Amino acid sequence: KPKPSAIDFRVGFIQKAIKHPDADSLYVSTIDVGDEEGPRTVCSGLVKHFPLDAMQERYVVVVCNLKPVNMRGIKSTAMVLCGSNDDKVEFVEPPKDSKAGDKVFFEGFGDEAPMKQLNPKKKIWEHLQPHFTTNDGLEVIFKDEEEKDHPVRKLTNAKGERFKVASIANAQVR
Structure with a gap:
């Protein structure tokens, strides 16, 4: 599964x-x-x-x-x-x-090293991008429709902070 x-x-x-x-x-x-x-x-x-x-x-x-x-x-x-x-x-x-250089990652998806280079044939980015958006608080989030227990993961860093846009809710983030 792409993650x-x-x-x-x-x-x-x-x-x-x-x-x-x-x-x-x-x-x-x-x-x-x-x-x-x-x-x-x-x-x-x-x-x-x-x-x-x-x-x-x-x-x-x-x-x-x-x-x-x-x-x-x-x-x-x-x-x-x-x-x-x-x-x-x-x-x-x-x-x-x-x-x-600060690592940026979605909640629950931070404790693994990224691939050195994404395999283009696997289209991981393309599979995932429709699910990168912003909430009403303008925070970047990842929607994981499969995971019923954690359907939304916030974009964060090592300090547990947030990554925002100026005004667009439900944004297309990519």
């Missing part, structure tokens, strides 16, 4: 973001995710949603173990987690005093 523990979620810090020189819809962010190898290069379709100043020196949640993607000629090695509806896109916001 959120397979996914490597972390807090990232966007050191710098620039326009993708060959793709108007994309920013290229340099994001510290606590790798011993330096920051990662991440391409995000956020240009129509946020200006450059909103990108700089921002703490984000990043998915870190998907296979890298060629995004208009630039290798993107992580993905910034956002909650969206039909009209609007919002960053998932780490809690106060988060640090780059």
